[PDB]
Each structure stands twice: as C-alpha cells, then as structure tokens.
C-alpha cells in the first residue's frame, strides 16, 4: 500500500518498451508501455514513447508511495536511456542500474534470418 524502495524493469525491444515498477520482492506495483499510452506502429519503439511510459508508471508508483528504485534494463530497445532519464526527472531516485538482457550460452536455435 505504501513503499519506499523498488525495482523498475524496462523491457525495451525493437517494437515496444514496457516499464514495470515492482517492490523489491518482484510484486508488481505499477506499469505502463508505449502501447498503453496510445502510441502505435513505429512510435511505440521511439525513445520518446519510452520517456512517456516511464513517466506515467513513475507517477503511478509515486502515488502508491515510492521514493527510490533500482533500474533493470532488458532488450536492445533504444528507449532505455530515455526511460531512465524520465524516471529520474519524474522523481524516483535511481539508486542503481543493471542490464539483464538474456544471453543464452548457445542453447536454443534462433529463428531463420528475415528475407531469405
């Protein structure tokens, strides 16, 4: 109901960026996305859309009550820095930043190349 510390996960792919503020235990608190803010097609992948989504999720989390968060970035999306700066500007204190992009140690076979 009221929190002080949290984790902001930014899953930013080439098509869309989702921002999810959870408690330190991984229980979701608030979330937003470029698609959730009405952006469509290319705009969903733009850095600006990441900024707006991060702002909205930050506002919801802060209304829930939240001062500091640590950021976990995932995916190769371009909007990661935009979302981070959006969080900081909106107020959440970004204590630490980490990249959690999955890196298979070979493992599973990826799909075929496009246009072949």
């Amino acid at each position: 109901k009221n929190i002080e510390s949290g984790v902001a996960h930014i899953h930013s792919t080439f098509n869309n960026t989702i921002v999810m503020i959870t408690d330190t235990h991984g229980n979701a608190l608030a979330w937003s996305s470029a698609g959730s803010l009405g952006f469509k097609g290319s705009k969903k992948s733009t850095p600006f859309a990441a900024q707006m989504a991060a702002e909205a999720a930050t506002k919801v989390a802060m209304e829930h009550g939240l001062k500091t968060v640590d950021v976990t970035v995932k995916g190769p999306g371009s909007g990661r820095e935009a979302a981070i700066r959006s969080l900081q500007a909106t107020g959440l204190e970004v204590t630490a930043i980490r990249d959690v992009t999955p890196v298979p140690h070979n493992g599973c076979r990826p799909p075929k190349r496009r246009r072949v």
Partner: protein, 153 residues
C-alpha cells in the same frame, strides 16, 4: 539551392507606420505589382482597425502576428520506404512569412465585400486569438505534437 544559403534582400520601412513588417504585408497582399492598390488597402484596413478599437493598428497587427506565427511546423521526411512528418522549430523568418501568408489568405477567404474590411476583421480576430489564421496555427501545432515522437530526427 545546392550551392548553399542565398542572400536575403531587405525591405524599407513603411512611409507612414515606419514598419518593415507593414511593407512586407503590403508586398504579400500585392498582386501583379499593383503596389499602390496594395498599400491603399493596407492603410484603409488599418484605419478600420483604429476606428473599431482604441488600440494602435500597428500594435493590433503585431498582436495578430504573435497569435498566428507558428513555433513548430511539420516537414515530411522520407526514410527508406516510409515517409512521415517530423516536427521542426520554425526559424523566425519563416515564422513571419507564415504569419503574413496565413493572414492574407484567410482575409481573402473571408466573406466581407471589400479586401480592407476582410483584412481588418481577420487581423482583429487574430489579435483576439481567434479566427481562421489562429486555427491554422493551432492545427500546425497539433500536427507537430502528434508527430512529436520523431523529434530525434
């Protein structure tokens, strides 16, 4: 052109209002080089403005310019197979040009009988922050905001 930026020719201030802006307005409203007709129209419209309101017509006109001159325009950019609009800050010269062009076009589109009457009405509406020119500026800003996601371009 390809070579680079071109020299811009300056204009002289108006004989009575001492306003290069007024001279530019006369030039914009001029047709087929009938500058006498254009200047008479502009001065008659300014007199109409001074009669209809207690404010200096020059100040009313500058109020209209302040209310009509855009700040962010949309320029079409073709990237690969995708062509989309991109917001762009309007340099002051193009701002003034757009203001004058919009004012003159919507004055000509107005419904009153005489051009000076139409122009005075449009100028006063723009000063009051209403009318076709103000709507045009608002729509330009709306388009820029809609395409604002492409600012990095």
């Amino acid at each position: 052109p390809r070579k680079g930026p071109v020299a811009k020719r300056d204009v002289l201030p108006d004989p009575i209002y001492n306003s290069k802006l007024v001279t530019r307005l006369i030039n914009r409203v001029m047709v087929d080089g009938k500058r006498g007709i254009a200047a008479n129209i502009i001065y008659n419209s300014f007199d109409i403005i001074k009669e209809s309101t207690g404010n200096d017509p020059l100040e009313v006109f500058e109020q209209a310019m302040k209310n009509v001159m855009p700040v962010l325009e949309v320029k079409a950019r073709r990237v690969g197979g995708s062509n989309y609009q991109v917001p762009v800050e309007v340099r002051p010269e193009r701002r003034t040009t757009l203001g004058l062009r919009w004012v003159v076009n919507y004055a000509r589109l107005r419904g009153e009988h005489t051009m000076e009457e139409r122009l005075a009405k449009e100028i006063m509406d723009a000063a009051n922050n209403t009318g076709a020119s103000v709507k045009k500026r608002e729509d330009t800003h709306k388009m820029a905001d809609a395409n604002r996601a492409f600012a990095h371009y």
